[PDB]
């Protein structure tokens, strides 16, 4: 699949190391030659070692080999395809009939499925199938779960997007608090759920829930090796601000919240800016 060998040779040569420097104590010269020739599958352990030898990041090497873009597999394509269909509705149908059937194939597929459902809901397309099954789908998917992976938090984020909060909450509660970090991607999705969930809580005025998500997020900051997302920190902090304004009625809070919204415009995050503005406008009403 991925040309890891050639990336190794590439880096090996840029840094002026000889084959010997890499294989010495790990494999025969002949074998290593196969490795760089990409004619021999390399083991995670071996790759890890060559990585230390080269002095270049293991994950970076994998990325350079082709583990980046989602095109690495079917599921990846399907996901890229979504955003395409988002802007080109007409596409929907065609695909949705291939996806929908396999929505319970893997956590990855269910997420994509919810992706389509999100598009339809935006352009008001008919999705009778969805309404007649999610409840059952979620039951099947999470009834006897005990440990959650990134994809689960990804699912819950999209879930919160195409269903009433009340239908999703039951599934969230047992997924927090987080106790460990399992990579940038993992850290990212766990934060996204909080951000979306807190936003919904504020919009619907459920201050007890809002309170909860704010604490969950704050707790994340206490975790070793956790990568908090700055933009999320800003947005969640603006929500905290609004929260405090809705409760303590503190004028200062409203001011801070507005300063944060301003900052997004300043640093150029226009999309986010418009969102929070329309979100604040709304909050001073519904």
């Amino acid at each position: 699949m991925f040309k890891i060998g050639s990336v190794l040779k590439q880096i090996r040569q840029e840094l002026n190391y000889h084959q010997i420097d890499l294989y010495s104590g790990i494999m025969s010269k002949s074998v290593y030659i196969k490795v760089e020739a990409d004619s021999r599958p390399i083991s995670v352990e071996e790759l890890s070692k060559f990585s230390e030898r080269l002095g270049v990041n293991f994950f970076e090497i994998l990325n350079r080999a082709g583990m980046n873009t989602k095109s690495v597999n079917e599921t990846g394509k399907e996901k890229l395809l979504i955003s395409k269909i988002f802007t080109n509705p007409d596409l929907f149908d065609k695909n949705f009939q291939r996806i929908e059937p396999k929505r319970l194939t893997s956590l990855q597929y269910f997420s994509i499925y919810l992706g389509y459902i999100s598009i339809a809901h935006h352009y008001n397309i008919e999705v009778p199938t969805f309404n007649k099954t999610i409840t059952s789908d979620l039951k099947h998917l999470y009834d006897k779960r005990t440990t959650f992976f990134g994809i689960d938090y990804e699912i819950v984020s999209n879930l919160l997007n195409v269903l009433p909060y009340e239908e999703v909450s039951s599934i969230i509660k047992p997924m927090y608090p987080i106790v460990d970090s399992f990579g940038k991607d993992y850290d990212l999705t766990i934060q996204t759920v909080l951000k979306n969930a807190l936003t919904i809580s504020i919009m619907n005025r459920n201050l007890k829930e809002a309170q909860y998500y704010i604490n969950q997020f704050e707790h994340l900051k206490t975790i070793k090796n956790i990568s908090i997302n700055g933009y999320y920190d800003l947005e969640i902090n603006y929500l905290k601000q609004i929260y405090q304004f809705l409760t303590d009625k503190n004028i200062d809070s409203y001011l801070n919240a507005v300063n944060i919204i301003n900052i997004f415009k300043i640093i150029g995050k226009e999309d986010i800016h418009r969102s929070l503005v329309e979100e604040l406008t709304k909050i001073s009403a519904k």
Binding site: K70, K79, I82, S83, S111, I112, G115, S118, G150, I151, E154, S157, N158, L160, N161, D185, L188, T189, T192, K195, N196, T199, I200, E235, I272, S275, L276, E279
Partner: peptide
């Protein structure tokens, strides 16, 4: 805001 994440 209510973000959609696809990884």
């Amino acid at each position: 805001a209510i973000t959609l994440i696809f990884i």
